[PDB]
Amino acid sequence: MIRVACVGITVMDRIYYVEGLPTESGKYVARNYTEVGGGPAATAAVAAARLGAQVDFIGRVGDDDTGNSLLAELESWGVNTRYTKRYNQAKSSQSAIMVDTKGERIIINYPSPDLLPDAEWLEEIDFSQWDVVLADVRWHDGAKKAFTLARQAGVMTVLDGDITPQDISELVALSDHAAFSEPGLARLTGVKEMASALKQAQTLTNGHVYVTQGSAGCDWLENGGRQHQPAFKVDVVDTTGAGDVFHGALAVALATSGDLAESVRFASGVAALKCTRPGGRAGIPDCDQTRSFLSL
Amino acid sequence: MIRVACVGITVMDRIYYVEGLPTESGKYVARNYTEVGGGPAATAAVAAARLGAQVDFIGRVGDDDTGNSLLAELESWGVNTRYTKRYNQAKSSQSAIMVDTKGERIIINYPSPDLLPDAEWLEEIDFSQWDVVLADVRWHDGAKKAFTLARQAGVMTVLDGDITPQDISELVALSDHAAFSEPGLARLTGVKEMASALKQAQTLTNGHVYVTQGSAGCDWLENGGRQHQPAFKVVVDTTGAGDVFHGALAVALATSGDLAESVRFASGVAALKCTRPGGRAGIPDCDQTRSFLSL
Ligand SMILES: Nc1ncnc2c1ncn2[C@@H]1O[C@H](COP(=O)(O)OP(=O)(O)NP(=O)(O)O)[C@@H](O)[C@H]1O
Ligand SMILES: Nc1ncnc2c1ncn2[C@@H]1O[C@H](COP(=O)(O)OP(=O)(O)NP(=O)(O)O)[C@@H](O)[C@H]1O
Ligand SMILES: [Mg+2]
C-alpha cells in the first residue's frame, strides 16, 4: 500500500437525461437520472484507490443529504473521508446537469459558500502519515496549508494545476511536482506557447513541471530539456475526468518509483484506459488491468 | 374543521438561483441554492394545513433519506401522511429547478420508476372522512381512483390540471372543479388561446373550469362568461405558486362555496408565497392573507 492524501473539492453531479435541452420557461420530464461524485481531488482519490493505494480525501462537505451521499460514494470506491470536515447547517457543492439525446450538457454548478475557504483546521492533521499529498487548485487555502505542512514533514507534494480565476503561483512554489493543464499553464504564465510557458513555470519551483495536452500526451522539464510522453492510441468513448484520473495515477506512480518518465507513462496509461469506457469514474482501471495494458 | 385529502406526488425540489435561464449548452454558476419539498398535491396539502384545515397527503414515497425527509417535512407542516404508501428499497422523486432574477422557472422532474402507478390500494381507504379531495395529474391512477371514490361518497373533487404526458380528460370528467395551468389547458385541448381552450374544457365536465396564468392572474367560466382575477403585484421565487393556489382554492371553495372569493383568496396566498425562496417558506396563514388582501 502506498499512502495518498487528496486535498481539494468534492461535488455531487445530479444528471438528468432529457429529449431536448431546456431552452425557455416551463416543466420538463427526465426519462432517466443518475448521480455521481466529481471534484478533481475527489476523482484523483478514486483513481489512486482503484490502483491499490490507501487514499484519504481531505476537503469540505455540509451536513445535508448531498454531503452524506458524497462521502458514501467515496467510501464505496475505497477512499477514506475521516479527515473531511462536515460544516454544521451547511449545503455541499452540487451541479444539476441536463443531457440531450446528442450528449450536449447544461451544467448548473453551485459552489457552496457555506464551505468556508479558511484551511487553518488542517493544522490539526499530521501529514507525516502519507507518502504523497495531491491538491487541486479549487480550494486554494487548502492546497496552500496542506502543501506547507507536507513540505515541513518532508512529504512529496503533487499539484493538479488546472485553470482558475485565482493565481496558483504560491501553490506551484510549494509543489515538488506541478502537473498543469494547457489552460492552467496559460492562465498562470500569460504565455500561449506551451514550450515557453513550461520554462516560465519552472522559475516558480525547485520541483518538476508537467503539462497535459489530451491526445497530444504529456510534456515535462528534466535537466532543463523538454521530455515527451505520447498519449496511448485507444478506442475513445469518453475523456470525462481523464485529467483527474491522470493526476491520481501520477501521484501513486511518483510515490512508488520516483521515476518521472515511468510515472508519466503509467498515468498516461491509466487515463487512456479510462477514456475507452463510459463515465469519469466507471472506466478507471485497477493496477492489474493497468499492468496488463502496459505489458502489450 | 375543514377536512382535506391531497392525492398526488411528493418530490424533493433542488432550486438553483441563476442570473439568466440557460439559453444554450455550457456551464453556468448558481448565485444561490435551496432544497425544499415540492409536488403539486404535497405543497397544496402544506398550504391547506397553514390555512387551518386537517390535511391528509395520499401519495407514494421510497424508503431513502429523501422519502424520510419528504414525510418529515410534511408532518412538520401539520400534514398527516398516514395514508401515504412507502415502497421498500425505492428511490423517491426529485426535481431540479432553475430560477432567474425575474423569477422565470425551468423544472426538470425525475418521477422515480420504483413508485408503482397501481392505485388499487386506495380502495382500502374510506373517502367519506373528508369534505374535499384535491388531486394533481402527476399520479393518474391515483387521481382517477381517488376521484371515483370521492364522487361515490358525495365529496367535492378539485383537480390541479398541470401539463403531463398523459390525457387528463377522464380526470376532468370526474372534477367538480378543474383548475388548469396555461400549459395544462393547452396540452389537454390543443387551443393556444386560453379563452377558447377554457370553453373547450367546459364541455368535458358538469363542474367549473379555471386557468392560472402566473402574473397574468386567473380566469374561470361562470354563467357562460369568462371572469378574471388579476395577480397581486408583489417576487423572489414563483416555485410552487400553482400548488399553493390549488391548496388555498380547495380550502376556500369548501369554506364559502363562492368561486370569485375563493379565486381571490388563493391568488392572495400564492402572491405572498412568491416573496420568499422555495415552494413552502412564504405560504401565508389566514390572518396574514386577510391582512394582505385588506391592504
Ligand atoms: N483522447 C485521448 N486519448 C488518449 N489519452 C488521452 C486522451 N485524452 C486525455 N488523455 C490522457 O489523459 C491525460 C490528461 O488529459 P488532458 O485532456 O490533458 O487533461 P485536462 O486538460 O486536465 N482535461 P480534464 O480531465 O477534462 O480536466 C493526457 O496527458 C493523456 O495522457
Ligand atoms: N409572479 C406572480 N405574481 C403574482 N401572483 C403570481 C405570480 N405567479 C403566480 N401567481 C399567482 O399564483 C397563481 C398560480 O400560479 P401560476 O404560475 O399560474 O401556476 P403554475 O404555472 O401552475 N406554477 P407552478 O406551481 O410552478 O406549477 C396565479 O393564479 C396567481 O394569482
Ligand atoms: Mg483537468
Swiss-Prot record, chain B:
The keyword Nucleotide-binding applies. One of its GO terms (cellular component) is cytosol. ATP binds at T212, G214, G217, G242. The keyword Transferase applies. Induction: Induced during growth with sulfoquinovose. Keywords: ATP-binding, Carbohydrate metabolism, Kinase, Nucleotide-binding, Transferase. It comes from the Bacteria. One of its GO terms (molecular function) is kinase activity. 6-deoxy-6-sulfo-D-fructose binds at D13, K27, G39, S95, R138, D243. Pfam families: PfkB (PF00294). Gene3D superfamilies: 3.40.1190.20. One of its GO terms (biological process) is 6-sulfoquinovose(1-) catabolic process to glycerone phosphate and 3-sulfolactaldehyde. Disruption phenotype: Mutant fails to grow on sulfoquinovose as a sole carbon source. It catalyses: 6-deoxy-6-sulfo-D-fructose + ATP = 6-deoxy-6-sulfo-D-fructose 1-phosphate + ADP + H(+). Strongly inhibited by ADP. Activated by sulfoquinovose (SQ), sulfolactaldehyde (SLA) and dihydroxyacetone phosphate (DHAP) (through effects on KM) and by fructose 6-phosphate (F6P), fructose bisphosphate (FBP), phosphoenolpyruvate (PEP) and citrate (through effects on kcat/KM). Its EC number is 2.7.1.184. It is an enzyme of class 2 (transferase). Homodimer. Phosphorylates 6-deoxy-6-sulfo-D-fructose (SF) to 6-deoxy-6-sulfo-D-fructose 1-phosphate (SFP). Cannot phosphorylate fructose 6-phosphate. Belongs to the carbohydrate kinase PfkB family. PANTHER family: SUGAR KINASE, SULFOFRUCTOSE KINASE. This is Sulfofructose kinase. It comes from Escherichia coli (strain K12). The lineage of its organism: Bacteria, Pseudomonadati, Pseudomonadota, Gammaproteobacteria, Enterobacterales.
